[PDB]
Amino acid sequence: KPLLSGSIPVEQFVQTLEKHGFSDIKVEDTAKGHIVLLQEAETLIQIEEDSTHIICDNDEMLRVRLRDLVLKFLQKF
């Protein structure tokens, strides 16, 4: 796999989640980042500087979907 770099803007990320069929998306603020909350697989997406952490139940199709959308905001080295 390639090294990744870049940032995930939370507004844009949420908008693309909606474009891809997710609804009722909730967003918390943290000290400098955000957490996106989805009912699907009780998912948290922690969005911080140089760090994205997807925490979800074992729903591989859901995880792959989020993985792919996150990767579209990053550069691949």
Add this chain to the structure above:
Amino acid sequence: VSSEQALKELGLAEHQLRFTCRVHLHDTRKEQETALRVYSHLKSVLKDHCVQHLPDGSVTVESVLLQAAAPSDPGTKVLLVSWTYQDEELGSFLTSLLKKGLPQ
């Protein structure tokens, strides 16, 4: 140019993309027994890989980390499986594998 040189040449930091999957397993044994059963199963199935049972009872397969969650319900163990994007194939493989449970 390599991948880290091509990052450093642009002033950029690496972005860590991390996954933690909450795997549910039915086991009425103590969680430590569960973790041992998980370790033995993975060591048998993934013979070509580095598979470890660490002194805190956690399990690893290359750099994929498998840990007990905090004890729940007494018959359900949650195994937090965590990996970064570097190990994406291995990580999805392991969560897929554990969907089928463990040897009897």
